[PDB]
Ligand binder design. Structure first.
Ligand SMILES: OC[C@H]1O[C@@H]2O[C@H]3[C@H](O)[C@@H](O)[C@@H](O[C@H]4[C@H](O)[C@@H](O)[C@@H](O[C@H]5[C@H](O)[C@@H](O)[C@@H](O[C@H]6[C@H](O)[C@@H](O)[C@@H](O[C@H]7[C@H](O)[C@@H](O)[C@@H](O[C@H]8[C@H](O)[C@@H](O)[C@@H](O[C@H]1[C@H](O)[C@H]2O)O[C@@H]8CO)O[C@@H]7CO)O[C@@H]6CO)O[C@@H]5CO)O[C@@H]4CO)O[C@@H]3CO
Length: 80
């Protein structure tokens, strides 16, 4: 059982993490270096997420994405 590192390297000033794991609320990320990071204990399974970056909903382009039932694009983590 192992925590998941969320690391936004896309730049910006104020970044929050949102996802199924927090009912799409906003977790403010702490800036380390030029990046923004959180560590979450996510259980086994699938978890959709997105970033809110300087007032804009945004996904990480390097990471897996899926289209939601809302027609919106989320990143996705799968924990074994
Ligand atoms: O809030 C939870 C939600 O968070 C994240 O979503 C954000 C998203 O990432 C941002 O991009 C932005 O969304 C904007 C979007 O980009 C714009 O295109 C626009 O959206 C309009 C739609 O394009 C338009 O089609 C219409 O939408 C209607 C749907 O088509 C219709 O199906 C229905 O939608 C309902 C869903 O079918 C149902 O499943 C349920 O939706 C839930 C999602 O399935 C679930 O994943 C989660 O959603 C996340 C999302 O995945 C994240 O990316 O919870 C959802 C809510 O419970 O309920 C839907 C109805 O609530 O009805 C809609 C509305 O008629 O209109 C929309 C509005 O114009 O506008 C967006 C800006 O608001 O922001 C969202 C956060 O709001």
């Amino acid at each position: 059982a192992r925590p998941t590192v969320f690391r936004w390297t896309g730049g910006g000033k104020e970044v929050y993490l949102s996802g199924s794991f927090n009912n799409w609320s906003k977790l403010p990320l702490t800036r380390s270096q030029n990046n923004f990071v959180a560590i979450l204990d996510l259980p086994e399974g699938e978890h959709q997420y997105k970033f809110f970056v300087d007032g804009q909903w945004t996904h990480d382009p390097s990471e897996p994405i899926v289209t939601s039932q809302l027609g919106t694009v989320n990143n996705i983590i799968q924990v074994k």
